[PDB]
């Protein structure tokens with residue numbers, strides 16, 4: 001039962017742009033609800049050139065609100081202004097793609113493998129709620145703290161019926177370099193096509209934000225995949241980590257790993273992280289943590 005909370009425009013203060021792009025425009029702000037009188041850091045999303053498109057996103061997010069998973073973004077409510085806006089808790093450390101690019105010199109094995117676990121736990125939750133994301137990528141993972149990441153952006157997400165195993169898409173722009181072959185060829189999307197995208201997302205993290213198939217046009221991808229070519233082994237990845245990615249990119253969808261399997265294997269690896277990822281100076285690296293006495297420094301800076 002999907003309940004949309006409508007937030008008053010007048011309850012938001014110090015609204016400022018964070019960034020723009022394919023996702024539209026995201027702002028940060030302080031939501032002070034009347035009565036409670038407490039300042040809650042919030043992110044605000046809108047499109048600028050339909051109000052329909054963003055309500056579909058709010059529906060899907062409202063539809064999977066029954067259970068609180070810590071690794072998927074919660075809709076706090078919408079706001080009606082000049083445009084329709086989505087509202088969520090601010091993820092202060094921002095987008096994981098940008099984060100791995102900027103903090104490369106202090107990202108150790110433990111962090112990369114833990115992130116992989118947390119994204120698999122988030123997708124497993126969404127699979128249980130019959131949700132196909134259709135846009136899993138580093139750009140659609142956010143950082144609450146360097147130890148804690150959440151899946152976001154349900155603009156392409158589809159809920160499957162009790163009977164339905166797959167969603168057939170119509171003519172609509174889609175991220176080719178993150179999509180399974182059968183999605184490129186036949187516009188078919190399943191939980192197992194999301195596993196392919198999970199594979200690409202992991203490659204992005206292990207390369208500290210490299211562009212997949214860089215300098216290759218989107219029209220050559222299906223032919224490259226049909227020849228048996230895949231994204232290369234990242235320098236830091238031992239064979240077991242790369243084999244997981246290659247299992248995610250298998251032609252037979254049902255042969256690909258399940259998220260429940262990916263949780264367990266990446267969990268096993270997180271218990272001995274230096275065995276599975278080889279990073280120079282791993283033990284000398286550090287990122288801010290809530291347990292740190294001076295963590296309030298990082299939150300205010302970022």
Ligand SMILES: COc1c(Cl)cccc1Nc1c(-c2ccncc2OC[C@@H]2CCCO2)[nH]c2c1C(=O)NCC2
Pocket residue numbers: 018019020023026042043044045073074075086087088089090091092094095139140142152153154
């Ligand atoms: C769908 O969940 C949201 C809602 Cl309901 C409201 C506002 C933002 C989001 N999520 C997103 C954030 C976001 C959510 C929370 N806190 C900070 C955020 O942005 C951080 C940086 C700024 C611009 C790129 O990401 N950033 C992005 C989305 C998104 O949906 N697609 C890609 C970029």
Ligand SMILES: [Cl-]
Pocket residue numbers: 174175176177178218
């Ligand atoms: Cl693309």
